[PDB]
Amino acid sequence: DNYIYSTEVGGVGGTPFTFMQESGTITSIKFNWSDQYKLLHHIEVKFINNANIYATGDPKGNHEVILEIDDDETIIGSVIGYKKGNDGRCTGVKLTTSKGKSIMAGYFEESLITTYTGKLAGIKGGAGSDIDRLGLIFLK
Amino acid sequence: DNYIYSTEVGGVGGTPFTFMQESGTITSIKFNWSDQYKLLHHIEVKFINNANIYATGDPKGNHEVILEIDDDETIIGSVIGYKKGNDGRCTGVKLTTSKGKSIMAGYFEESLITTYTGKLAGIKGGAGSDIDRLGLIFLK
Amino acid sequence: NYIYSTEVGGVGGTPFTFMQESGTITSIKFNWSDQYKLLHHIEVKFINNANIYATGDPKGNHEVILEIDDDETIIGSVIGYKKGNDGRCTGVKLTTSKGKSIMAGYFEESLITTYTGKLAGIKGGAGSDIDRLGLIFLK
Amino acid sequence: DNYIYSTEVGGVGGTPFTFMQESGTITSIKFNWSDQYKLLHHIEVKFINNANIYATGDPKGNHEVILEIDDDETIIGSVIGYKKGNDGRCTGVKLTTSKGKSIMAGYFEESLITTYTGKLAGIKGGAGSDIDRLGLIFLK
Amino acid sequence: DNYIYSTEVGGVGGTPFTFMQESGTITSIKFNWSDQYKLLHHIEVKFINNANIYATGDPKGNHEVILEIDDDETIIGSVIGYKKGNDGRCTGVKLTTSKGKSIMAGYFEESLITTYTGKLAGIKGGAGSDIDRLGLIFLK
Amino acid sequence: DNYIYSTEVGGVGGTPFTFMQESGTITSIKFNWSDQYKLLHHIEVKFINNANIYATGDPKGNHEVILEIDDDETIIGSVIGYKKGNDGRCTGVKLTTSKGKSIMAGYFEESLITTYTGKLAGIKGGAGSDIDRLGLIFLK
Amino acid sequence: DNYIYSTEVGGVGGTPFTFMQESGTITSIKFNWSDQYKLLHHIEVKFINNANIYATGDPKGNHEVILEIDDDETIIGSVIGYKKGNDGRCTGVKLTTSKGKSIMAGYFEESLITTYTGKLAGIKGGAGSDIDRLGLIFLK
Ligand SMILES: OC[C@H]1O[C@H](O[C@@H]2[C@H](O)[C@@H](OC[C@H]3O[C@H](O)[C@@H](O)[C@@H](O[C@H]4O[C@H](CO)[C@@H](O)[C@H](O)[C@@H]4O[C@H]4O[C@H](CO)[C@@H](O)[C@H](O)[C@@H]4O[C@H]4O[C@H](CO)[C@@H](O)[C@H](O)[C@@H]4O)[C@@H]3O)O[C@H](CO)[C@H]2O)[C@@H](O)[C@@H](O)[C@@H]1O
Ligand SMILES: OC[C@H]1O[C@H](O[C@@H]2[C@H](O)[C@@H](OC[C@H]3O[C@H](O)[C@@H](O)[C@@H](O[C@H]4O[C@H](CO)[C@@H](O)[C@H](O)[C@@H]4O[C@H]4O[C@H](CO)[C@@H](O)[C@H](O)[C@@H]4O[C@H]4O[C@H](CO)[C@@H](O)[C@H](O)[C@@H]4O)[C@@H]3O)O[C@H](CO)[C@H]2O)[C@@H](O)[C@@H](O)[C@@H]1O
Ligand SMILES: OC[C@H]1O[C@H](O[C@@H]2[C@H](O)[C@@H](OC[C@H]3O[C@H](O)[C@@H](O)[C@@H](O[C@H]4O[C@H](CO)[C@@H](O)[C@H](O)[C@@H]4O[C@H]4O[C@H](CO)[C@@H](O)[C@H](O)[C@@H]4O[C@H]4O[C@H](CO)[C@@H](O)[C@H](O)[C@@H]4O)[C@@H]3O)O[C@H](CO)[C@H]2O)[C@@H](O)[C@@H](O)[C@@H]1O
Ligand SMILES: OC[C@H]1O[C@H](O)[C@@H](O)[C@@H](O)[C@@H]1O
Numbered sequence A, B, D, E, F, G: 001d002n003y004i005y006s007t008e009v010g011g012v013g014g015t016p017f018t019f020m021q022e023s024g025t026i027t028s029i030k031f032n033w034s035d036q037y038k039l040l041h042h043i044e045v046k047f048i049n050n051a052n053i054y055a056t057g058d059p060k061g062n063h064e065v066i067l068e069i070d071d072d073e074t075i076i077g078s079v080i081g082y083k084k085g086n087d088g089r090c091t092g093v094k095l096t097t098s099k100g101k102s103i104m105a106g107y108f109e110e111s112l113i114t115t116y117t118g119k120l121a122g123i124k125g126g127a128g129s130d131i132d133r134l135g136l137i138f139l140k
Numbered sequence C: 001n002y003i004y005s006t007e008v009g010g011v012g013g014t015p016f017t018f019m020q021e022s023g024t025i026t027s028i029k030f031n032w033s034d035q036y037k038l039l040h041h042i043e044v045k046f047i048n049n050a051n052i053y054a055t056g057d058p059k060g061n062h063e064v065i066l067e068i069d070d071d072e073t074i075i076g077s078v079i080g081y082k083k084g085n086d087g088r089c090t091g092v093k094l095t096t097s098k099g100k101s102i103m104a105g106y107f108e109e110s111l112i113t114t115y116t117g118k119l120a121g122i123k124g125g126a127g128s129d130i131d132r133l134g135l136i137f138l139k
Helices: none
Strands: A015-020 A026-033 A040-047 A054-057 A063-068 A075-083 A089-097 A102-106 A111-114 A120-127 A131-138 B003-005 B015-019 B026-033 B040-047 B050-057 B063-068 B075-083 B089-097 B102-106 B111-114 B120-127 B131-139 C002-004 C014-018 C025-032 C039-046 C049-056 C062-067 C074-082 C088-096 C101-105 C110-113 C119-126 C130-138 D015-019 D026-033 D040-047 D050-057 D063-068 D075-083 D089-097 D102-106 D111-114 D120-127 D131-138 E003-005 E015-019 E026-033 E040-047 E050-057 E063-068 E075-083 E089-097 E102-106 E111-114 E120-127 E131-139 F015-019 F026-033 F040-047 F054-057 F063-068 F075-083 F089-097 F102-106 F111-114 F120-127 F131-138 G015-019 G026-033 G040-047 G050-057 G063-068 G075-083 G089-097 G102-106 G111-114 G120-127 G131-138
Touching (some): A015 A054, A026 A089, A026 A102, A063 A102, A075 A131, A102 B111, A111 C101, B003 B120, B015 B050, B026 B102, B026 B120, B040 B120, B050 B120, B075 B131, B102 D111, C025 C119, C074 C130, D026 D089, D026 D102, D040 D120, D102 F111, E003 E120, E015 E050, E026 E102, E040 E131, E050 E120, E063 E102, E111 G102, F026 F102, F040 F131, F063 F102, F075 F131, F102 G111, G015 G050, G026 G120, G040 G089, G050 G120, G063 G102, G075 G131
Parallel strands (some): A111 C062, B063 D111, C110 E063, E111 G063
Antiparallel strands (some): A026 A063, A075 A111, A120 A131, B015 B120, B075 B089, B075 B111, B089 B131, C002 C130, C025 C062, C039 C049, C074 C110, C088 C101, D015 D120, D026 D040, D026 D063, D075 D089, D089 D102, D089 D131, D120 D131, E003 E131, E075 E089, E075 E111, E089 E131, E120 E131, F015 F120, F026 F040, F040 F054, F075 F111, G026 G040, G075 G089, G089 G102
């Protein structure tokens, strides 16, 4: 195959999403999260050479972070916080890049995945009011 | 054009501004901010081979920082603090350069972007009494 | 064709061996509790094999997953345990050739710092808890 | 024109000074400052191959620091503390060199500039009872 | 004669042991120690290409550590804690390897040796209820 | 001709001294200082291939430090503490060498110089009961 | 002749000792010290290719440290604590080696020397009940 699919962590809930393009990798990713519910609620992605925003979940949280990614820039560290099980949720993300940039969204009070690394190509999971489930997708 | 436009973060308010000159990159950037309102209020920029000062917003704040940038010097780290939403504002900036220089202006109490990196060429956004909206522009 | 790291913990539980000629370990998951301060359950996936190999009882309130690139090795590895006949594994720390690390469970009694290299399988004893755990590496 | 002029920071007050010599770069720089007023008061400079001492301001402060600079030694980091506006003053300086030497004079309670870097050739500004205004000058 | 013998530290007590094999170097070493007596009590060693476990002392302590050693891996730091004199004992060990592995057993409340370094080939000393005396053996 | 004279810091008092030899560099330097007066009182220097001690001031202090300097060893960092003005004194010294050796004598409660660097050749200043004034001398 | 003699620090008391052998450098050195008197009391040295133990002073202290030194291993840092004057003593030693090994014996409450560096070949000084005086000897 062309792509590495990291494990989707969290619950079975929400509307499914899959954001990926062969015409370009992820150039921007935004996480929205709340202190009220200590969850991720909403994620937006942009791809190289495309102004259109791909969004999932409900932007109801009181914080957001954006990581912008240079064309030649990779994810060298990547950690997702979540509550496990059928009624699980994603609670937080830490990404670190080949250029020393990092972002930190939300909370890490239960379970963690340390994911595959590489060129971030897309995301996949389930979202409604919250991010139920998140899986990263990388190139080779 | 043949430039990278970082996302404009903050609100829709203020008078639009675009500071860019074909005959050069940014050589000096000044941020004015207040402890009263915890916002950026005013930005001034100078370009290589141009003694003109390009200013936006109202210099009402009680603090200022200036970063001066050598001709061969790049931004390798860059973070803008902001309040999100239609009535948003820029609250702070942290820049770090290829030569270990850094500045820190204002506050980081809600949302952050970690932007693209490279040769800082210009800025763009909206300002009135405050900096409503700010986006960096880099060369390729 | 393999290096067997020492199995640490008790003599209890049903014996298990997870290894495949088909590939190395691509994912490992540890489940542990704050109630009992033990590892309870481990799942492993191998390269080119969609089967999940599981041992123990996933009753704990925490889990961690490490995913491992095909060319990625373990360069540091520490297992916490209670020693003796009624011993248990209490925790794991792994660190990889690509700067990734995980930490599961507790380290309140005994430690092994294991051999290093390409993680190929695991071996030990499990029931309600992980009684005994040993890593297996390639040469 | 074959020199880099860093921004003069502080007020419009004081008697203007320019210390620069065709004979060489700066070999010694001394800052005098007070805890009473939390200001720089006085600066002395010596140049390569020149026994003359160039002084400005009033040496009334209770502290002084001297940086001596080897012929081949550059400033790789430089920060000036100041009060901004017409009635402004310089409050402090931090210099760091290509050889791991640093100095720190005075206070940093309001505004900062992170200046250009390079071979320090001269200084320029305004002084009376205090250092009103200071700007560094570097070679290329 | 083509081995380096580190000093045996501790007392003259216990039954003498030497763990060394022509068959290879040490691949595993285990230290057992107590908080009750703040002593090492028991040591087990395994060698390359030899399934036999060599043990000395009484495993009565409430802690144990194992260091496993790759075939190509050396000791680059090594410190043994002991009580000196005829009635001495080994109280603790810190070993650090060419691959950034380290272990720490027991206590360091009186005397220390920082030993020779290299490929750990064997150990030698005296043990009964406690480890009376310990000496490391390296290759040349 | 081919020596660098660092600034003499401290007061105008004391008996003048100048210790230098064309035949060789400083191989040992000793500082004596007191907690009573928080001053340097006495300095001794030895030169390469010469057992004779060159001394100034009064060894009345309750502490001494010696730095010994290998033939190929340089000073890469050097800081003298002093009280400024006509009735000034040297209060302390920190030296750091090309081989990671450092010494620290006395107190730093008023003024500092960070001196030139290089091969320490001699010293020069004024001493009586105290070290009134000290300047380092380096080669090229 | 082929040796560097570091300064003997401490008092004039005790029986003089010189430990040196031309058939090898120091392979082991032991320092014995007390908390009672805060002094070094006793030193033992072994040389390469010589099973004889060379000892001076009275082993009455409640602590000992041993450093073992590989054939190719040098001292890169070395500090001796002492009381100065005719009735002086050595109070402590810190050695650091080319292989990252270090030891620390006794106390450092008055005077320090940072000695020459290199291959430790011998020691020299005066001892009775205490180590009155100690000086290191290095090769070239
Ligand atoms: O770049 C951002 C933005 O800039 C331009 O838009 C701006 C904004 O719409 C707005 O900016 C000015 C206001 O900023 C904040 O809202 C406040 O600082 C506000 O001050 C009023 O409210 C404060 C909070 O309580 C209060 O402390 C102030 O005193 C003030 O309220 C008093 O004064 C105002 C004005 O004089 C009166 O209208 C009020 O009634 C009130 O006075 C009463 O109460 C007082 C206190 O008790 C009392 O002393 C007095 O006697 C009275 O009883 C700021 O006004 O508005 C700007 C209009 O100039 C507007 O330009 C645009 O460029 C936009 O595009 C851009 O995004
Ligand atoms: O580099 C800066 C600047 O330098 C040159 O310009 C300067 C300035 O114009 C100015 O600098 C000195 C003055 O700085 C401040 O204004 C004050 O620090 C001022 O001191 C007065 O105020 C102090 C704070 O209250 C006070 O502590 C002082 O005592 C003083 O006030 C007393 O003395 C003044 C002068 O004699 C009187 O006018 C006051 O009434 C007061 O005296 C009464 O009250 C006293 C206190 O209670 C009491 O003891 C006394 O008995 C009386 O009752 C500083 O003087 O002025 C400088 C002139 O020396 C001038 O050079 C230029 O180079 C410029 O370009 C540059 O920017
Ligand atoms: O590696 C070291 C050494 O090992 C081998 O040699 C060892 C030693 O000779 C020795 O090691 C075990 C002893 O260690 C310490 O000395 C003590 O822990 C000692 O226990 C006695 O003392 C303790 C501290 O006071 C005490 O808590 C213990 O109860 C015990 O003292 C009681 O029991 C002993 C033995 O039964 C009696 O003799 C005492 O009188 C006392 O009993 C009375 O008091 C009790 C406390 O109140 C009370 O309960 C009771 O009713 C009575 O009134 C450890 O024995 O001895 C080892 C033998 O086991 C020996 O192996 C060799 O290999 C050697 O070469 C090596 O160097
Ligand atoms: O694993 C803990 C424990 O679980 C159950 O009690 C049984 O399977 C035991 O054999 C085992 O030791």
